[PDB]
Design a binder for these strands. Structure first.
Ligand SMILES: [Ca+2]
Ligand SMILES: [Ca+2]
Ligand SMILES: [Ca+2]
Length: 341
DNA sequence: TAATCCTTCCCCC
DNA sequence: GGGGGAAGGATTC
């Protein structure tokens, strides 16, 4: 099999540059301003100009300014980006029917048909990198391999703005040499548990007795790693479906008083519905971010579709259930709609 | 600025 | 025992 993974470089900041070329060659930081206090918020993404110095996704907006006090700071604009992305996901469709849109900027292609070997593979990587650069003036990175996991890893290496192949032989050394923590789906926490169990390489997973790996990190995860290590991973490419929509927001001050919260909660549903568009959910969830930054949630399924009027009531009851079964204050509040018709 | 996998529950064959 | 399906939380991106 031969899978080609495509990944957009620092996407949000690149589109920002694209939309005002002057920004070219400068450190651009796409930020999310919570508006709580002076320059409060976080970092959505920074371009190469900023990254290399430390500014990265997750750092506060105040920390970033201490490093690059004079870079460009712009508020995120999901809508525009999302649309830019949509277009690009099309140039690709025009490269196969088997396309999996993993995220707003990640996508996998199943070219096992078209191309005959890694040779023609590269040609198409290039032929593809180009197209998107022409049509939309945006740089990406290609990864090619026996499957989605490596095609992706393939892309993490050759980044930014590169293209890389990882053929069987090389995969082999990776299953052994490649770090366990650098394997897709293994976040700190897991990579951590995998530490104790003495696992540090995909190989290491073959020594331990399954059931101890299962009682630890989970059967799915466990099986996932195994198949990978034994060189038997091969999940196909499928067209994923938005199985949920929501929208959380923050208040100027943490609160516990229901009246003080409602207004925020509604604004949340309001936007959530706008997103929904044409879609009708059967499930609802109120999500609260307590002051200590711990997420608390309460929801409910209905035997029918939820109207907007219904959401307003349902959400105010589930929020009450939250202030009840919890004494902490709320820093953020939002709704999540699922189980569409 | 959603996907997925778990774990525990609560019927009820 | 175990199918089926919330519900709430844990984990990755
Ligand atoms: Ca990226
Ligand atoms: Ca990782
Ligand atoms: Ca908790």
């Amino acid at each position: 099999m031969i899978v080609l993974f495509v990944d957009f470089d620092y996407f949000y900041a690149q589109v920002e540059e694209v939309l005002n070329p002057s920004l070219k060659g400068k450190p651009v930081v796409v930020c999310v301003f919570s508006g709580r206090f002076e320059d409060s918020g976080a970092v959505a993404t920074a371009n190469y100009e900023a990254r290399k110095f430390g500014v990265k996704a997750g750092i506060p907006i105040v920390e970033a300014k201490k490093i690059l006090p004079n870079a460009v700071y712009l508020p995120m604009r999901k809508e525009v980006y999302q649309q830019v992305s949509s277009r690009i996901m099309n140039l690709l469709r025009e490269y196969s029917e088997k396309i999996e849109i993993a995220s707003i900027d990640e996508a996998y292609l199943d070219i096992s048909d078209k191309v005959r070997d890694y040779r023609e593979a590269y040609n198409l990587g290039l032929e593809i990198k180009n197209k998107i650069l022409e049509k939309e003036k945006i740089t990406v990175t290609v990864g090619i391999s026996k499957n989605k996991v490596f095609a992706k890893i393939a892309a993490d290496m050759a980044k930014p703005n590169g293209i890389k192949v990882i053929d069987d032989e090389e995969v082999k050394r990776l299953i052994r040499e490649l770090d366990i923590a650098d394997v897709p789906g293994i976040g700190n926490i897991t990579a951590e548990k995998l530490k104790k169990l003495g696992i540090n390489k995909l190989v290491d997973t073959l020594s331990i007795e399954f059931d101890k790996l299962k009682g630890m990190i989970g059967e799915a995860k466990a099986k996932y790693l195994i198949s990978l290590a034994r060189d038997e991973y091969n999940e196909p490419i499928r067209t994923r479906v938005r199985k949920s929509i929501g929208r959380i927001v923050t208040m100027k001050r943490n609160s516990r008083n229901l009246e003080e919260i409602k207004p925020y909660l509604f604004r949340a549903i309001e936007e959530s519905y706008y997103k929904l568009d044409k879609r009708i959910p059967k499930a609802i969830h109120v999500v609260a971010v307590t002051e200590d930054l711990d997420i608390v949630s309460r929801g409910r399924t209905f035997p029918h579709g939820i109207s907007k009027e219904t959401a307003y009531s349902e959400s105010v009851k589930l929020l009450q259930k939250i202030l009840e079964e919890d004494e902490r204050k709320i820093r953020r509040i939002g709704v999540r709609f699922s189980k569409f018709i």
